[PDB]
Amino acid sequence: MVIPAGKLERVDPTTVRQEGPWADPAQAVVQTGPNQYTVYVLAFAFGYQPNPIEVPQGAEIVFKITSPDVIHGFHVEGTNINVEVLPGEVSTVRYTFKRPGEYRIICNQYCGLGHQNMFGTIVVKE
């Protein structure tokens, strides 16, 4: 089943949050392209963890969220951004802002959850 290739990378609860980009919050924002930063987000129901999310306006942003058995996603203003992917597979969305602004709220996530998942978290830096 878990055998990616073309697009979208599939992960596992094995050590995806213990080792790698999701392991430490320092690996959150990491430039991998000419003007595109790779953002990582993790949120599990087993304990507690920070939300070191970033999104510099003007440059491309590739958000990467992954969880063991919990949906996260995030709905940012400006556009009808619809990002929602079940746990067990890191997602990849391309959305860049034009101005600074802090937003952390979840809603209208396809199914329209509201009593399980968590509240998104994103921060823009000038």
mmCIF file with all atom_site columns, all heavy atoms in Angstrom, residues 2 11 14 18 21-22 26 35 41-43 46 50 56 63 65 79 89 93 96 99-100 106 109 113 115 125-126:
data_model
loop_
_atom_site.group_PDB
_atom_site.id
_atom_site.type_symbol
_atom_site.label_atom_id
_atom_site.label_alt_id
_atom_site.label_comp_id
_atom_site.label_asym_id
_atom_site.label_entity_id
_atom_site.label_seq_id
_atom_site.pdbx_PDB_ins_code
_atom_site.Cartn_x
_atom_site.Cartn_y
_atom_site.Cartn_z
_atom_site.occupancy
_atom_site.B_iso_or_equiv
_atom_site.pdbx_formal_charge
_atom_site.auth_seq_id
_atom_site.auth_comp_id
_atom_site.auth_asym_id
_atom_site.auth_atom_id
_atom_site.pdbx_PDB_model_num
ATOM 1   N N   . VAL A 1 2   ? 1.645   1.431  1.061  1.00 0.00 ? 2   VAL A N   1
ATOM 2   C CA  . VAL A 1 2   ? 2.522   2.591  1.183  1.00 0.00 ? 2   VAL A CA  1
ATOM 3   C C   . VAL A 1 2   ? 3.713   2.482  0.238  1.00 0.00 ? 2   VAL A C   1
ATOM 4   O O   . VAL A 1 2   ? 4.799   2.063  0.639  1.00 0.00 ? 2   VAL A O   1
ATOM 5   C CB  . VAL A 1 2   ? 3.038   2.755  2.625  1.00 0.00 ? 2   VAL A CB  1
ATOM 6   C CG1 . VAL A 1 2   ? 3.972   3.951  2.725  1.00 0.00 ? 2   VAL A CG1 1
ATOM 7   C CG2 . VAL A 1 2   ? 1.873   2.897  3.595  1.00 0.00 ? 2   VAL A CG2 1
ATOM 8   N N   . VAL A 1 11  ? 4.792   8.619  4.701  1.00 0.00 ? 11  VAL A N   1
ATOM 9   C CA  . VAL A 1 11  ? 5.604   8.374  5.886  1.00 0.00 ? 11  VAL A CA  1
ATOM 10  C C   . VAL A 1 11  ? 4.902   7.420  6.846  1.00 0.00 ? 11  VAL A C   1
ATOM 11  O O   . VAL A 1 11  ? 3.815   6.920  6.557  1.00 0.00 ? 11  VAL A O   1
ATOM 12  C CB  . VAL A 1 11  ? 5.926   9.686  6.627  1.00 0.00 ? 11  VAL A CB  1
ATOM 13  C CG1 . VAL A 1 11  ? 6.599   10.677 5.690  1.00 0.00 ? 11  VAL A CG1 1
ATOM 14  C CG2 . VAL A 1 11  ? 4.662   10.280 7.230  1.00 0.00 ? 11  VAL A CG2 1
ATOM 15  N N   . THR A 1 14  ? 6.517   5.295  12.665 1.00 0.00 ? 14  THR A N   1
ATOM 16  C CA  . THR A 1 14  ? 7.711   4.628  13.167 1.00 0.00 ? 14  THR A CA  1
ATOM 17  C C   . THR A 1 14  ? 8.637   5.614  13.870 1.00 0.00 ? 14  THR A C   1
ATOM 18  O O   . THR A 1 14  ? 8.815   5.555  15.087 1.00 0.00 ? 14  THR A O   1
ATOM 19  C CB  . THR A 1 14  ? 8.486   3.935  12.031 1.00 0.00 ? 14  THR A CB  1
ATOM 20  O OG1 . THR A 1 14  ? 7.587   3.172  11.219 1.00 0.00 ? 14  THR A OG1 1
ATOM 21  C CG2 . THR A 1 14  ? 9.569   3.025  12.590 1.00 0.00 ? 14  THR A CG2 1
ATOM 22  N N   . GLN A 1 18  ? 10.242  11.315 15.334 1.00 0.00 ? 18  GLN A N   1
ATOM 23  C CA  . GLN A 1 18  ? 11.379  11.125 16.227 1.00 0.00 ? 18  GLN A CA  1
ATOM 24  C C   . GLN A 1 18  ? 12.686  11.484 15.527 1.00 0.00 ? 18  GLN A C   1
ATOM 25  O O   . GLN A 1 18  ? 13.591  12.052 16.138 1.00 0.00 ? 18  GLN A O   1
ATOM 26  C CB  . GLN A 1 18  ? 11.431  9.677  16.719 1.00 0.00 ? 18  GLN A CB  1
ATOM 27  C CG  . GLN A 1 18  ? 10.139  9.207  17.365 1.00 0.00 ? 18  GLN A CG  1
ATOM 28  C CD  . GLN A 1 18  ? 10.036  7.696  17.434 1.00 0.00 ? 18  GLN A CD  1
ATOM 29  O OE1 . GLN A 1 18  ? 11.038  7.002  17.605 1.00 0.00 ? 18  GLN A OE1 1
ATOM 30  N NE2 . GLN A 1 18  ? 8.820   7.178  17.302 1.00 0.00 ? 18  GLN A NE2 1
ATOM 31  N N   . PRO A 1 21  ? 13.012  15.826 9.667  1.00 0.00 ? 21  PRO A N   1
ATOM 32  C CA  . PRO A 1 21  ? 12.627  17.240 9.688  1.00 0.00 ? 21  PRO A CA  1
ATOM 33  C C   . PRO A 1 21  ? 11.572  17.537 10.748 1.00 0.00 ? 21  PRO A C   1
ATOM 34  O O   . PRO A 1 21  ? 11.529  18.635 11.303 1.00 0.00 ? 21  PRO A O   1
ATOM 35  C CB  . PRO A 1 21  ? 12.057  17.474 8.287  1.00 0.00 ? 21  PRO A CB  1
ATOM 36  C CG  . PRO A 1 21  ? 11.590  16.132 7.840  1.00 0.00 ? 21  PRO A CG  1
ATOM 37  C CD  . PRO A 1 21  ? 12.535  15.137 8.455  1.00 0.00 ? 21  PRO A CD  1
ATOM 38  N N   . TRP A 1 22  ? 10.726  16.552 11.027 1.00 0.00 ? 22  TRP A N   1
ATOM 39  C CA  . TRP A 1 22  ? 9.672   16.709 12.022 1.00 0.00 ? 22  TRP A CA  1
ATOM 40  C C   . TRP A 1 22  ? 10.190  16.390 13.420 1.00 0.00 ? 22  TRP A C   1
ATOM 41  O O   . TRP A 1 22  ? 9.532   16.681 14.418 1.00 0.00 ? 22  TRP A O   1
ATOM 42  C CB  . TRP A 1 22  ? 8.486   15.803 11.686 1.00 0.00 ? 22  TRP A CB  1
ATOM 43  C CG  . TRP A 1 22  ? 7.739   16.232 10.459 1.00 0.00 ? 22  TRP A CG  1
ATOM 44  C CD1 . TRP A 1 22  ? 6.866   17.276 10.354 1.00 0.00 ? 22  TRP A CD1 1
ATOM 45  C CD2 . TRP A 1 22  ? 7.801   15.626 9.163  1.00 0.00 ? 22  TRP A CD2 1
ATOM 46  N NE1 . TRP A 1 22  ? 6.380   17.355 9.071  1.00 0.00 ? 22  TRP A NE1 1
ATOM 47  C CE2 . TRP A 1 22  ? 6.939   16.355 8.321  1.00 0.00 ? 22  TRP A CE2 1
ATOM 48  C CE3 . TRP A 1 22  ? 8.502   14.539 8.632  1.00 0.00 ? 22  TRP A CE3 1
ATOM 49  C CZ2 . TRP A 1 22  ? 6.760   16.030 6.978  1.00 0.00 ? 22  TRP A CZ2 1
ATOM 50  C CZ3 . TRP A 1 22  ? 8.323   14.219 7.300  1.00 0.00 ? 22  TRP A CZ3 1
ATOM 51  C CH2 . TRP A 1 22  ? 7.459   14.962 6.485  1.00 0.00 ? 22  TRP A CH2 1
ATOM 52  N N   . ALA A 1 26  ? 13.991  22.827 14.718 1.00 0.00 ? 26  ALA A N   1
ATOM 53  C CA  . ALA A 1 26  ? 15.006  23.588 13.999 1.00 0.00 ? 26  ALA A CA  1
ATOM 54  C C   . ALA A 1 26  ? 14.997  23.245 12.513 1.00 0.00 ? 26  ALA A C   1
ATOM 55  O O   . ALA A 1 26  ? 15.424  24.044 11.680 1.00 0.00 ? 26  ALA A O   1
ATOM 56  C CB  . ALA A 1 26  ? 16.382  23.327 14.594 1.00 0.00 ? 26  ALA A CB  1
ATOM 57  N N   . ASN A 1 35  ? 14.215  29.898 -4.297 1.00 0.00 ? 35  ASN A N   1
ATOM 58  C CA  . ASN A 1 35  ? 13.403  30.864 -3.564 1.00 0.00 ? 35  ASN A CA  1
ATOM 59  C C   . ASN A 1 35  ? 12.197  30.184 -2.922 1.00 0.00 ? 35  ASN A C   1
ATOM 60  O O   . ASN A 1 35  ? 11.155  30.807 -2.724 1.00 0.00 ? 35  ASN A O   1
ATOM 61  C CB  . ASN A 1 35  ? 12.935  31.981 -4.499 1.00 0.00 ? 35  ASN A CB  1
ATOM 62  C CG  . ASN A 1 35  ? 12.510  33.226 -3.744 1.00 0.00 ? 35  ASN A CG  1
ATOM 63  O OD1 . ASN A 1 35  ? 13.143  33.617 -2.763 1.00 0.00 ? 35  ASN A OD1 1
ATOM 64  N ND2 . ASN A 1 35  ? 11.434  33.856 -4.200 1.00 0.00 ? 35  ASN A ND2 1
ATOM 65  N N   . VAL A 1 41  ? 5.352   20.551 9.595  1.00 0.00 ? 41  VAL A N   1
ATOM 66  C CA  . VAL A 1 41  ? 4.391   20.669 10.685 1.00 0.00 ? 41  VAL A CA  1
ATOM 67  C C   . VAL A 1 41  ? 3.987   19.296 11.212 1.00 0.00 ? 41  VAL A C   1
ATOM 68  O O   . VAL A 1 41  ? 3.730   18.373 10.439 1.00 0.00 ? 41  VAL A O   1
ATOM 69  C CB  . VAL A 1 41  ? 3.126   21.427 10.239 1.00 0.00 ? 41  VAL A CB  1
ATOM 70  C CG1 . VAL A 1 41  ? 2.122   21.506 11.378 1.00 0.00 ? 41  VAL A CG1 1
ATOM 71  C CG2 . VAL A 1 41  ? 3.489   22.818 9.740  1.00 0.00 ? 41  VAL A CG2 1
ATOM 72  N N   . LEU A 1 42  ? 3.935   19.168 12.533 1.00 0.00 ? 42  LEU A N   1
ATOM 73  C CA  . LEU A 1 42  ? 3.561   17.909 13.166 1.00 0.00 ? 42  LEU A CA  1
ATOM 74  C C   . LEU A 1 42  ? 2.623   18.147 14.345 1.00 0.00 ? 42  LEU A C   1
ATOM 75  O O   . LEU A 1 42  ? 2.796   19.099 15.105 1.00 0.00 ? 42  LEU A O   1
ATOM 76  C CB  . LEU A 1 42  ? 4.811   17.162 13.637 1.00 0.00 ? 42  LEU A CB  1
ATOM 77  C CG  . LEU A 1 42  ? 4.642   15.664 13.893 1.00 0.00 ? 42  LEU A CG  1
ATOM 78  C CD1 . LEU A 1 42  ? 5.401   14.855 12.852 1.00 0.00 ? 42  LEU A CD1 1
ATOM 79  C CD2 . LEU A 1 42  ? 5.111   15.306 15.295 1.00 0.00 ? 42  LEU A CD2 1
ATOM 80  N N   . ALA A 1 43  ? 1.632   17.275 14.491 1.00 0.00 ? 43  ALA A N   1
ATOM 81  C CA  . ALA A 1 43  ? 0.669   17.388 15.581 1.00 0.00 ? 43  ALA A CA  1
ATOM 82  C C   . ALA A 1 43  ? 0.049   16.034 15.908 1.00 0.00 ? 43  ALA A C   1
ATOM 83  O O   . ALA A 1 43  ? -0.828  15.552 15.190 1.00 0.00 ? 43  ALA A O   1
ATOM 84  C CB  . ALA A 1 43  ? -0.414  18.395 15.224 1.00 0.00 ? 43  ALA A CB  1
ATOM 85  N N   . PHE A 1 46  ? -0.487  12.282 21.099 1.00 0.00 ? 46  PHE A N   1
ATOM 86  C CA  . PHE A 1 46  ? 0.323   11.625 22.117 1.00 0.00 ? 46  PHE A CA  1
ATOM 87  C C   . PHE A 1 46  ? 1.277   12.615 22.778 1.00 0.00 ? 46  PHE A C   1
ATOM 88  O O   . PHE A 1 46  ? 2.446   12.710 22.406 1.00 0.00 ? 46  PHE A O   1
ATOM 89  C CB  . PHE A 1 46  ? 1.115   10.469 21.502 1.00 0.00 ? 46  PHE A CB  1
ATOM 90  C CG  . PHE A 1 46  ? 0.249   9.372  20.954 1.00 0.00 ? 46  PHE A CG  1
ATOM 91  C CD1 . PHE A 1 46  ? -0.497  9.569  19.804 1.00 0.00 ? 46  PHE A CD1 1
ATOM 92  C CD2 . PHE A 1 46  ? 0.180   8.142  21.590 1.00 0.00 ? 46  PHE A CD2 1
ATOM 93  C CE1 . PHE A 1 46  ? -1.297  8.562  19.297 1.00 0.00 ? 46  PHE A CE1 1
ATOM 94  C CE2 . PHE A 1 46  ? -0.618  7.131  21.088 1.00 0.00 ? 46  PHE A CE2 1
ATOM 95  C CZ  . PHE A 1 46  ? -1.356  7.341  19.940 1.00 0.00 ? 46  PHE A CZ  1
ATOM 96  N N   . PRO A 1 50  ? 5.396   21.805 19.981 1.00 0.00 ? 50  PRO A N   1
ATOM 97  C CA  . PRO A 1 50  ? 5.305   23.171 19.460 1.00 0.00 ? 50  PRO A CA  1
ATOM 98  C C   . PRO A 1 50  ? 4.796   23.211 18.023 1.00 0.00 ? 50  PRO A C   1
ATOM 99  O O   . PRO A 1 50  ? 4.531   22.172 17.420 1.00 0.00 ? 50  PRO A O   1
ATOM 100 C CB  . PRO A 1 50  ? 6.749   23.674 19.529 1.00 0.00 ? 50  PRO A CB  1
ATOM 101 C CG  . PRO A 1 50  ? 7.583   22.440 19.466 1.00 0.00 ? 50  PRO A CG  1
ATOM 102 C CD  . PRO A 1 50  ? 6.790   21.369 20.162 1.00 0.00 ? 50  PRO A CD  1
ATOM 103 N N   . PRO A 1 56  ? 7.359   32.953 4.542  1.00 0.00 ? 56  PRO A N   1
ATOM 104 C CA  . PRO A 1 56  ? 7.841   34.244 4.041  1.00 0.00 ? 56  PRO A CA  1
ATOM 105 C C   . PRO A 1 56  ? 7.153   34.656 2.744  1.00 0.00 ? 56  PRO A C   1
ATOM 106 O O   . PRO A 1 56  ? 7.205   33.935 1.748  1.00 0.00 ? 56  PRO A O   1
ATOM 107 C CB  . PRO A 1 56  ? 9.332   33.996 3.801  1.00 0.00 ? 56  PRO A CB  1
ATOM 108 C CG  . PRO A 1 56  ? 9.440   32.528 3.571  1.00 0.00 ? 56  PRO A CG  1
ATOM 109 C CD  . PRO A 1 56  ? 8.377   31.896 4.427  1.00 0.00 ? 56  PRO A CD  1
ATOM 110 N N   . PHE A 1 63  ? 4.427   23.819 2.350  1.00 0.00 ? 63  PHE A N   1
ATOM 111 C CA  . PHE A 1 63  ? 4.045   23.288 3.654  1.00 0.00 ? 63  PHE A CA  1
ATOM 112 C C   . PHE A 1 63  ? 4.033   21.762 3.637  1.00 0.00 ? 63  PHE A C   1
ATOM 113 O O   . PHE A 1 63  ? 3.580   21.144 2.674  1.00 0.00 ? 63  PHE A O   1
ATOM 114 C CB  . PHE A 1 63  ? 2.667   23.816 4.059  1.00 0.00 ? 63  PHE A CB  1
ATOM 115 C CG  . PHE A 1 63  ? 2.627   25.307 4.244  1.00 0.00 ? 63  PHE A CG  1
ATOM 116 C CD1 . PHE A 1 63  ? 2.562   26.151 3.147  1.00 0.00 ? 63  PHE A CD1 1
ATOM 117 C CD2 . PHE A 1 63  ? 2.653   25.862 5.512  1.00 0.00 ? 63  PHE A CD2 1
ATOM 118 C CE1 . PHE A 1 63  ? 2.525   27.523 3.314  1.00 0.00 ? 63  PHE A CE1 1
ATOM 119 C CE2 . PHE A 1 63  ? 2.617   27.233 5.686  1.00 0.00 ? 63  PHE A CE2 1
ATOM 120 C CZ  . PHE A 1 63  ? 2.551   28.064 4.584  1.00 0.00 ? 63  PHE A CZ  1
ATOM 121 N N   . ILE A 1 65  ? 2.809   18.803 6.209  1.00 0.00 ? 65  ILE A N   1
ATOM 122 C CA  . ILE A 1 65  ? 2.194   18.332 7.444  1.00 0.00 ? 65  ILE A CA  1
ATOM 123 C C   . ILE A 1 65  ? 2.057   16.814 7.447  1.00 0.00 ? 65  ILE A C   1
ATOM 124 O O   . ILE A 1 65  ? 1.751   16.204 6.422  1.00 0.00 ? 65  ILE A O   1
ATOM 125 C CB  . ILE A 1 65  ? 0.805   18.963 7.656  1.00 0.00 ? 65  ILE A CB  1
ATOM 126 C CG1 . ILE A 1 65  ? 0.837   20.452 7.307  1.00 0.00 ? 65  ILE A CG1 1
ATOM 127 C CG2 . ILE A 1 65  ? 0.344   18.759 9.092  1.00 0.00 ? 65  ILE A CG2 1
ATOM 128 C CD1 . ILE A 1 65  ? 0.322   20.760 5.918  1.00 0.00 ? 65  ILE A CD1 1
ATOM 129 N N   . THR A 1 79  ? -7.093  33.626 0.057  1.00 0.00 ? 79  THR A N   1
ATOM 130 C CA  . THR A 1 79  ? -7.569  32.765 -1.018 1.00 0.00 ? 79  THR A CA  1
ATOM 131 C C   . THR A 1 79  ? -8.299  31.546 -0.465 1.00 0.00 ? 79  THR A C   1
ATOM 132 O O   . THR A 1 79  ? -8.204  31.242 0.724  1.00 0.00 ? 79  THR A O   1
ATOM 133 C CB  . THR A 1 79  ? -6.410  32.292 -1.915 1.00 0.00 ? 79  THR A CB  1
ATOM 134 O OG1 . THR A 1 79  ? -5.391  33.297 -1.969 1.00 0.00 ? 79  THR A OG1 1
ATOM 135 C CG2 . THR A 1 79  ? -6.903  31.987 -3.321 1.00 0.00 ? 79  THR A CG2 1
ATOM 136 N N   . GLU A 1 89  ? 0.922   10.403 5.738  1.00 0.00 ? 89  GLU A N   1
ATOM 137 C CA  . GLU A 1 89  ? 1.458   10.853 4.460  1.00 0.00 ? 89  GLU A CA  1
ATOM 138 C C   . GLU A 1 89  ? 1.628   12.370 4.447  1.00 0.00 ? 89  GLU A C   1
ATOM 139 O O   . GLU A 1 89  ? 0.660   13.116 4.597  1.00 0.00 ? 89  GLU A O   1
ATOM 140 C CB  . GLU A 1 89  ? 0.541   10.422 3.314  1.00 0.00 ? 89  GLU A CB  1
ATOM 141 C CG  . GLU A 1 89  ? -0.937  10.577 3.629  1.00 0.00 ? 89  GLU A CG  1
ATOM 142 C CD  . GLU A 1 89  ? -1.818  10.363 2.412  1.00 0.00 ? 89  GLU A CD  1
ATOM 143 O OE1 . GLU A 1 89  ? -1.729  11.175 1.466  1.00 0.00 ? 89  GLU A OE1 1
ATOM 144 O OE2 . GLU A 1 89  ? -2.594  9.385  2.405  1.00 0.00 ? 89  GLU A OE2 1
ATOM 145 N N   . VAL A 1 93  ? 1.766   21.655 -0.327 1.00 0.00 ? 93  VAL A N   1
ATOM 146 C CA  . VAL A 1 93  ? 0.969   22.740 -0.888 1.00 0.00 ? 93  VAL A CA  1
ATOM 147 C C   . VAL A 1 93  ? 1.834   23.960 -1.186 1.00 0.00 ? 93  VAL A C   1
ATOM 148 O O   . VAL A 1 93  ? 2.740   24.293 -0.423 1.00 0.00 ? 93  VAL A O   1
ATOM 149 C CB  . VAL A 1 93  ? -0.168  23.152 0.067  1.00 0.00 ? 93  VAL A CB  1
ATOM 150 C CG1 . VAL A 1 93  ? 0.391   23.869 1.286  1.00 0.00 ? 93  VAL A CG1 1
ATOM 151 C CG2 . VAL A 1 93  ? -1.180  24.026 -0.658 1.00 0.00 ? 93  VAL A CG2 1
ATOM 152 N N   . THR A 1 96  ? 1.943   31.233 -1.270 1.00 0.00 ? 96  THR A N   1
ATOM 153 C CA  . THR A 1 96  ? 2.748   32.320 -0.729 1.00 0.00 ? 96  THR A CA  1
ATOM 154 C C   . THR A 1 96  ? 1.906   33.572 -0.508 1.00 0.00 ? 96  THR A C   1
ATOM 155 O O   . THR A 1 96  ? 1.011   33.877 -1.297 1.00 0.00 ? 96  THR A O   1
ATOM 156 C CB  . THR A 1 96  ? 3.925   32.665 -1.662 1.00 0.00 ? 96  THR A CB  1
ATOM 157 O OG1 . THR A 1 96  ? 4.769   33.643 -1.044 1.00 0.00 ? 96  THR A OG1 1
ATOM 158 C CG2 . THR A 1 96  ? 3.420   33.194 -2.996 1.00 0.00 ? 96  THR A CG2 1
ATOM 159 N N   . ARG A 1 99  ? 1.957   39.817 2.411  1.00 0.00 ? 99  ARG A N   1
ATOM 160 C CA  . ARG A 1 99  ? 2.164   40.661 3.582  1.00 0.00 ? 99  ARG A CA  1
ATOM 161 C C   . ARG A 1 99  ? 2.204   39.823 4.856  1.00 0.00 ? 99  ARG A C   1
ATOM 162 O O   . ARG A 1 99  ? 1.763   38.675 4.887  1.00 0.00 ? 99  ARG A O   1
ATOM 163 C CB  . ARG A 1 99  ? 1.057   41.711 3.683  1.00 0.00 ? 99  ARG A CB  1
ATOM 164 C CG  . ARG A 1 99  ? 1.409   43.035 3.024  1.00 0.00 ? 99  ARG A CG  1
ATOM 165 C CD  . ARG A 1 99  ? 0.548   43.294 1.798  1.00 0.00 ? 99  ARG A CD  1
ATOM 166 N NE  . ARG A 1 99  ? -0.615  44.120 2.112  1.00 0.00 ? 99  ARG A NE  1
ATOM 167 C CZ  . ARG A 1 99  ? -1.614  44.336 1.264  1.00 0.00 ? 99  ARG A CZ  1
ATOM 168 N NH1 . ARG A 1 99  ? -1.592  43.787 0.057  1.00 0.00 ? 99  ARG A NH1 1
ATOM 169 N NH2 . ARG A 1 99  ? -2.639  45.099 1.622  1.00 0.00 ? 99  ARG A NH2 1
ATOM 170 N N   . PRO A 1 100 ? 2.747   40.409 5.934  1.00 0.00 ? 100 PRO A N   1
ATOM 171 C CA  . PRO A 1 100 ? 2.857   39.735 7.231  1.00 0.00 ? 100 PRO A CA  1
ATOM 172 C C   . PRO A 1 100 ? 1.500   39.538 7.899  1.00 0.00 ? 100 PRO A C   1
ATOM 173 O O   . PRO A 1 100 ? 0.545   40.256 7.609  1.00 0.00 ? 100 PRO A O   1
ATOM 174 C CB  . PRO A 1 100 ? 3.725   40.689 8.055  1.00 0.00 ? 100 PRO A CB  1
ATOM 175 C CG  . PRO A 1 100 ? 3.508   42.027 7.436  1.00 0.00 ? 100 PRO A CG  1
ATOM 176 C CD  . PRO A 1 100 ? 3.293   41.776 5.970  1.00 0.00 ? 100 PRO A CD  1
ATOM 177 N N   . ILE A 1 106 ? -8.573  26.425 12.414 1.00 0.00 ? 106 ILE A N   1
ATOM 178 C CA  . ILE A 1 106 ? -9.005  25.356 11.521 1.00 0.00 ? 106 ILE A CA  1
ATOM 179 C C   . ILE A 1 106 ? -10.506 25.425 11.267 1.00 0.00 ? 106 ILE A C   1
ATOM 180 O O   . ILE A 1 106 ? -11.289 25.700 12.177 1.00 0.00 ? 106 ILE A O   1
ATOM 181 C CB  . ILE A 1 106 ? -8.656  23.970 12.093 1.00 0.00 ? 106 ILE A CB  1
ATOM 182 C CG1 . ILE A 1 106 ? -9.072  22.871 11.114 1.00 0.00 ? 106 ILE A CG1 1
ATOM 183 C CG2 . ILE A 1 106 ? -9.329  23.768 13.443 1.00 0.00 ? 106 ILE A CG2 1
ATOM 184 C CD1 . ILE A 1 106 ? -10.438 22.289 11.404 1.00 0.00 ? 106 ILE A CD1 1
ATOM 185 N N   . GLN A 1 109 ? -12.516 22.054 6.527  1.00 0.00 ? 109 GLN A N   1
ATOM 186 C CA  . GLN A 1 109 ? -11.473 21.143 6.071  1.00 0.00 ? 109 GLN A CA  1
ATOM 187 C C   . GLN A 1 109 ? -12.075 19.942 5.350  1.00 0.00 ? 109 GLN A C   1
ATOM 188 O O   . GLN A 1 109 ? -11.927 18.801 5.792  1.00 0.00 ? 109 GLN A O   1
ATOM 189 C CB  . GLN A 1 109 ? -10.626 20.671 7.255  1.00 0.00 ? 109 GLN A CB  1
ATOM 190 C CG  . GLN A 1 109 ? -9.807  21.779 7.897  1.00 0.00 ? 109 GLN A CG  1
ATOM 191 C CD  . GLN A 1 109 ? -8.484  22.011 7.192  1.00 0.00 ? 109 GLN A CD  1
ATOM 192 O OE1 . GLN A 1 109 ? -8.069  21.215 6.349  1.00 0.00 ? 109 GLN A OE1 1
ATOM 193 N NE2 . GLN A 1 109 ? -7.814  23.105 7.534  1.00 0.00 ? 109 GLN A NE2 1
ATOM 194 N N   . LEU A 1 113 ? -14.466 19.092 10.056 1.00 0.00 ? 113 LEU A N   1
ATOM 195 C CA  . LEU A 1 113 ? -14.252 18.623 11.421 1.00 0.00 ? 113 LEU A CA  1
ATOM 196 C C   . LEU A 1 113 ? -14.514 19.740 12.426 1.00 0.00 ? 113 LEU A C   1
ATOM 197 O O   . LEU A 1 113 ? -14.697 20.897 12.052 1.00 0.00 ? 113 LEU A O   1
ATOM 198 C CB  . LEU A 1 113 ? -12.824 18.099 11.584 1.00 0.00 ? 113 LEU A CB  1
ATOM 199 C CG  . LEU A 1 113 ? -12.608 16.625 11.242 1.00 0.00 ? 113 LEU A CG  1
ATOM 200 C CD1 . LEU A 1 113 ? -13.394 15.736 12.193 1.00 0.00 ? 113 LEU A CD1 1
ATOM 201 C CD2 . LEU A 1 113 ? -13.003 16.348 9.799  1.00 0.00 ? 113 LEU A CD2 1
ATOM 202 N N   . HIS A 1 115 ? -14.124 18.675 16.355 1.00 0.00 ? 115 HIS A N   1
ATOM 203 C CA  . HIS A 1 115 ? -14.151 17.982 17.638 1.00 0.00 ? 115 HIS A CA  1
ATOM 204 C C   . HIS A 1 115 ? -13.173 16.810 17.642 1.00 0.00 ? 115 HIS A C   1
ATOM 205 O O   . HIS A 1 115 ? -13.460 15.753 18.205 1.00 0.00 ? 115 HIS A O   1
ATOM 206 C CB  . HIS A 1 115 ? -15.564 17.482 17.942 1.00 0.00 ? 115 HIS A CB  1
ATOM 207 C CG  . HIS A 1 115 ? -15.987 17.710 19.360 1.00 0.00 ? 115 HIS A CG  1
ATOM 208 N ND1 . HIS A 1 115 ? -16.637 16.756 20.115 1.00 0.00 ? 115 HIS A ND1 1
ATOM 209 C CD2 . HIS A 1 115 ? -15.848 18.792 20.163 1.00 0.00 ? 115 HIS A CD2 1
ATOM 210 C CE1 . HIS A 1 115 ? -16.881 17.241 21.319 1.00 0.00 ? 115 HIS A CE1 1
ATOM 211 N NE2 . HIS A 1 115 ? -16.412 18.474 21.374 1.00 0.00 ? 115 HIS A NE2 1
ATOM 212 N N   . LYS A 1 125 ? 6.692   36.038 7.899  1.00 0.00 ? 125 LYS A N   1
ATOM 213 C CA  . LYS A 1 125 ? 7.807   36.917 8.234  1.00 0.00 ? 125 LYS A CA  1
ATOM 214 C C   . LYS A 1 125 ? 8.161   37.817 7.054  1.00 0.00 ? 125 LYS A C   1
ATOM 215 O O   . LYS A 1 125 ? 8.322   37.347 5.929  1.00 0.00 ? 125 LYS A O   1
ATOM 216 C CB  . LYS A 1 125 ? 9.028   36.093 8.644  1.00 0.00 ? 125 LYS A CB  1
ATOM 217 C CG  . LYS A 1 125 ? 8.686   34.873 9.481  1.00 0.00 ? 125 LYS A CG  1
ATOM 218 C CD  . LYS A 1 125 ? 7.969   35.259 10.764 1.00 0.00 ? 125 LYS A CD  1
ATOM 219 C CE  . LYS A 1 125 ? 8.823   36.183 11.621 1.00 0.00 ? 125 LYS A CE  1
ATOM 220 N NZ  . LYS A 1 125 ? 8.608   35.944 13.075 1.00 0.00 ? 125 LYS A NZ  1
ATOM 221 N N   . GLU A 1 126 ? 8.281   39.115 7.321  1.00 0.00 ? 126 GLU A N   1
ATOM 222 C CA  . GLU A 1 126 ? 8.617   40.080 6.280  1.00 0.00 ? 126 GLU A CA  1
ATOM 223 C C   . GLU A 1 126 ? 10.059  39.900 5.817  1.00 0.00 ? 126 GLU A C   1
ATOM 224 O O   . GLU A 1 126 ? 10.394  40.189 4.668  1.00 0.00 ? 126 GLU A O   1
ATOM 225 C CB  . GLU A 1 126 ? 8.408   41.507 6.792  1.00 0.00 ? 126 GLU A CB  1
ATOM 226 C CG  . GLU A 1 126 ? 7.041   41.737 7.412  1.00 0.00 ? 126 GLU A CG  1
ATOM 227 C CD  . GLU A 1 126 ? 7.042   41.543 8.916  1.00 0.00 ? 126 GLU A CD  1
ATOM 228 O OE1 . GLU A 1 126 ? 6.866   40.392 9.367  1.00 0.00 ? 126 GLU A OE1 1
ATOM 229 O OE2 . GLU A 1 126 ? 7.221   42.543 9.643  1.00 0.00 ? 126 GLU A OE2 1
#
